[PDB]
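Hi F.,

I've been meaning to write this up properly since the lab meeting, where we talked about keeping a consistent format for the predictions we share between groups. The idea is simple: the sequence comes first, exactly as it goes in, then the structure tokens exactly as they come out, then a line or two of notes. No screenshots and no reformatting. I'm using this chain as the first example so we have something concrete to point to.
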Amino acid sequence: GECEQCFSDGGDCTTCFNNGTGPCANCLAGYPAGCSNSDCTAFLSQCYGGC
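Output, unedited:
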């Protein structure tokens, strides 16, 4: 998981999103399925509430 990797490397939200080029980046704008996902999901559970 790209977003999971960033999470394991101590990253939260900003310090992974990297303004729209990061691992959890598509999980932000176009994220209707991001909660029903897994790789995006824990990040979004923090950074948005996880739907």
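Notes:
The longest helix spans residues 2-8.
The CA atoms of residues 19 and 25 lie 8 Å apart.

If this format works for you, I'll send the rest the same way.

G.
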